[PDB]
Structures are given as C-alpha cells and as structure tokens.
Ligand binder design. Structure first.
Ligand SMILES: CC(=O)N[C@H]1[C@H](O[C@@H]2[C@@H](OC[C@H]3O[C@H](O)[C@@H](O)[C@@H](O[C@H]4O[C@H](CO)[C@@H](O)[C@H](O)[C@@H]4O[C@@H]4O[C@H](CO)[C@@H](O)[C@H](O)[C@H]4NC(C)=O)[C@@H]3O)O[C@H](CO)[C@@H](O)[C@@H]2O)O[C@H](CO)[C@@H](O)[C@@H]1O
Ligand SMILES: CC(=O)N[C@H]1[C@H](O[C@H]2[C@@H](O)[C@H](O)[C@@H](CO)O[C@@H]2O)O[C@H](CO)[C@@H](O)[C@@H]1O
Ligand SMILES: [Ca+2]
Ligand SMILES: [Ca+2]
Ligand SMILES: [Mn+2]
Ligand SMILES: [Mn+2]
Lengths: 240, 240
C-alpha cells in the first residue's frame, strides 16, 4: 504494498532497481538520459528513459482507495546551442511501457507520431520541461519554453512559461492529492525563482491500478544533455 | 537507492512486487507460506518463501556506509496436531537466492542438508521462530520452542525460549543498527507477553552489498500453517 518510498540523493554506477531504456545511462553519479560523446558533449537523435523497477499501486478498485504521492527531483540541462532540445519529463505509465517507435525529438520519448495527440490512444501522465518550441515542427507547443502537464497527449492540458538556464539545477516537487485530485508542480532555481502549475485529474480514469514511474528525455536535430541529479518518491494508498 | 521502504498492512491477491517460491501463495489477504488443502488445513512436506522484488542496498564499499534497517511483521501458526512444525523465518540473502534442494522440514527452506551447519558454504542471516526440536532430526536445536538468530547456519548463534500459541498472531520487530552492529529482535503476543534476543554481527562480512529480504517456512512430517499477515520494511544507508 500500500506504501512505497525510495530515495536517490545521487546515482552511483552500481544500480540494481532501475530499468534503463534507450540511451539512458549513469555517468558521474547522475543519470544521463540522452547520449553524450566521449567528451561528455550532447549529440543529436537520442532518446533515453529510466523507470524504478518496483511497480507502484496507484489506485485500488476493490477498496476504492487512490494513492497520495510525491516525487522530488533535480536536473540540469546544458548545450552549446542557442536552442537546446528537446526536454525532460517525469512520467507515470503502465508497467510494460517501452520507448515508442519514432518518439524522439519533440515527442520526448513518450509518444508515437501517429497518435501523439490522440488522447484515447495513450495512457500516460507526465510533467514536461520543454525547451524547444519551434512552431513549424512542435506545432502543439506554445511559443516559448514551458513546464507542461501532459495527460495522454503531447499537447499539454496546461503550460506555464518557464526559463531554461544552462547548467543550473532545477528542483521540482510533484504532488498528487487524491482528496482534491489536484496534481501540483512547484519548481525552483537556487536563486529562489519559482514556477507553479496545478491541474485536476482523476488518475483512475487515465491509468491502470499498478504503474511504473520514471523519467524520459530526447533530442532531435537540436540537442542538450538531460541530467537527472537526484530523485525521491513516496506513495501511500488513501481512502477517498 | 540509499533509502527504501514498503508496507503491506495486508496481502491482497493482486500482487506485483513479490517473488513467490515453492508453495507460497496469497489466500484470504494473507500469505500462506506452506501448502494447505481445499479446506485450508496444513499438509506435510511443503516449503514456501516470498521475497520483495526490489533489491536492498545493505552496505556500500565505496562510501563505507552500512544500512540501518527495520522489519515489522505479524504471523500466526495453526495446526490440528499439538506438535506443529517446522517454523517460519525472516531472512536476508543474495538477490538470486532460491530454495535449496532438500531444505524442507527443520531446514526451514533456507539450507541444504549437506551444508546446513557449514558457515563457510552459506550467505544468509535469518531470524527463526522454530516450533519443532526433536533431537533425532533437529540435532542442532535447543530442547524447546525458540526464537533464534541464524548466521550462515541452521544452528542459531543465539536463541531465547519461546512459546508457540496456536492461532494467535505474534508481532515482531527486527532492527539492525550499524553503529552498534546489534541485530535486535522483539516479539510480542497481544496480551503483552514479550520475547527478546539480540546478537552483534557485521553484516558486511556475511552478505553482499545488495540483497533481497523475505520469509521462508517449511513443514516436514509434522505440520502447521505459516501465515504471514502484515509486513513493513525500511532501510537507510548511514555513515558510521
Ligand atoms: C533527428 C530526429 O531525432 N528527429 C525526430 C524529430 O525531431 C524534430 C526535429 O525537427 C527538425 C527541424 O524541424 C523544422 O525544420 C524546424 O523546427 C527546425 O528547427 C530549426 O529551425 C527553426 C526555424 O525553421 C528554428 O525556429 C529552430 O530554432 C531551429 O533553428 C536552427 O537551429 C540550429 C541550431 O542552433 C541552427 O544551426 C540553424 O541555423 C537554425 N535553423 C533556422 C532555419 O533558423 C528543426 O530542427 O528536431 C527538433 C529539435 O530537436 C524536434 O523538436 C522535432 O521534433 O521528431 C520526430 C517526432 O515528431 C521524431 O520521430 C524524429 O526522430
Ligand atoms: C517429510 C519431509 O518433508 N521430510 C523433510 C525432513 O523433515 C524431518 C525434520 O527435518 C522435521 O523437523 C520433522 C518434522 O516436520 O520431519 C522430519 O523428520 O527434513 C529434511 C531436512 O533435514 C528434508 O530434506 C525432508 O524433506
Ligand atoms: Ca517541444
Ligand atoms: Ca527446528
Ligand atoms: Mn510542450
Ligand atoms: Mn532452531
């Protein structure tokens, strides 16, 4: 299970409970979601994701309970380009989730091109930190970098303007309260700059009872490193 | 991960993070470690174990840290006989552990007949609740029911006399403090009857850095059900 929690203050190379997909790998005590060359420089056309191995009991039909969960994490992005792409996302999906074919670039390793905006063809809740918004390729995006809440589609149900800061760690707290059904996101930079966004969603109508949680990132023609520095997660089933 | 915790207040049939070995299975929101017939009565010659799927980081060579952990669980034993056997044990072992051949009866599903008392051939720390001690077959046991701490051998390094109460739940708290290296066990029945046993052990010289935790039980010619009712576990790597 009814309750599960784990904490990664750092990510040593000796990992046993992380499922690595695509190009994701551990380097220098952090998870590099997207591929980097020998000099640690980012490269184009790469997708990578990690998931915690144990499944999370998100809700329970029989007992009418839904989990209260919190995910705290920090990441940094770096690129020599003026338009580093494409972004990193914290996501919740069915346990057998894998990288969809062609999900690179602006699809952040979460959606397949053909059904990216078909809400009835997907089962995913994600919080994206999207740094690439060219209106000719990322037609679904607002015209500025943003934090978005994605529910079964790459076209966010809600976005707020966000500032990308090269090489600076962003600390994020994502919380879900089953009583109000509010998914809240609060992100801060070390100088105190803060971003907040909330959305009401009944997770029971979007995801199965058991899910896996993790992160995904991708780079298309433009690129940047997507470094996950720390992560703690806790979930507990509660009556509603 | 550095920290991990999980809680099972009960055991619904829909499990995803438990590894079942032998005859162990879920029945009536509890784990029945040993086989039972259609009427739910215990049968002879059965072994069953469960392990939590995520691996626990017990100690870290690079940082010189060792985990502080706590395991709380409750179980009950019942048998038509008056000489129910053989017992249940909470154990910690390498992640790939499996039921050894011939480990039924008094070996509790934890040791192989030929190496049961050879400390150099095993890697396991267990806390046993042993109800059968006939000296012809269980030659290593004290002559009475007991709780024992087992370190690489079925012959406990430390035991305390214990009372088996048919059908009554025993609440147990097992704690390991890396500062003192004390593995402490406290068991209590609902009326307040308490049993305590402890032993100093350097887990680093007995087990690998990553392990799995779980329970094991067995019945040889004599039998009883070994019902695990609830289980909570928490571990945190600490500097000492
Ligand atoms: C290779 C790969 O993995 N592909 C993914 C794919 O990724 C998409 C891909 O888009 C390619 C380009 O699409 C359009 O042409 C543009 O949006 C272009 O962006 C450049 O041009 C626009 C203007 O037209 C600018 O606004 C934008 O900033 C960018 O500017 C260019 O920047 C570079 C570097 O600074 C500079 O050298 C150029 O001079 C400059 N060009 C111009 C004209 O100014 C896109 O690059 O890559 C995007 C970025 O990574 C992704 O967001 C896209 O999704 O995505 C599909 C899924 O949809 C996936 O299947 C495929 O594998
Ligand atoms: C019938 C059976 O399962 N035999 C196992 C045997 O059991 C012994 C003893 O260990 C038990 O304590 C008592 C009471 O249940 O029954 C028998 O006498 O133990 C062997 C291990 O020493 C197992 O290999 C046998 O499978
Ligand atoms: Ca985008
Ligand atoms: Ca015995
Ligand atoms: Mn977006
Ligand atoms: Mn014994």
């Amino acid at each position: 299970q009814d309750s599960l929690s784990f904490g990664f203050p750092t990510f040593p190379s000796d990992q046993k409970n992380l499922i690595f997909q695509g190009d994701a790998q551990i380097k220098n005590n952090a998870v590099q979601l997207t591929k980097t060359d020998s000099n640690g420089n980012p490269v184009a056309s790469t997708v990578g994701r990690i998931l915690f191995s144990a499944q999370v009991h998100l809700w329970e039909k029989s007992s009418s309970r839904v989990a209260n969960f919190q995910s705290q994490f920090s990441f940094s992005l770096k690129s020599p380009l003026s338009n580093g792409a494409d972004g990193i996302a914290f996501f919740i999906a069915p346990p057998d989730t894998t990288i969809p074919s062609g999900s690179g670039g602006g699809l952040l390793g979460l959606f397949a091109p053909g059904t990216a905006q078909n809400t009835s063809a997907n089962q995913v809740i994600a919080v994206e930190f999207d740094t690439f918004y060219a209106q000719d390729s990322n037609t679904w995006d607002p015209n500025y970098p943003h934090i978005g809440i994605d529910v079964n589609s790459i076209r966010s149900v809600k976005t707020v303007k966000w500032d990308r800061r090269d090489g600076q760690s962003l600390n994020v707290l994502v919380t879900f309260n089953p009583s109000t059904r509010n998914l809240d996101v609060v992100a801060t930079y070390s100088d105190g700059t803060r971003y907040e966004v909330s959305y009401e969603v009944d997770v029971r109508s979007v995801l199965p009872e058991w899910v896996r949680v993790g992160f995904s990132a991708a780079s298309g023609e433009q690129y940047q490193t997507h470094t996950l520095e720390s992560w703690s997660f806790t979930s507990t089933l509660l009556y509603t």
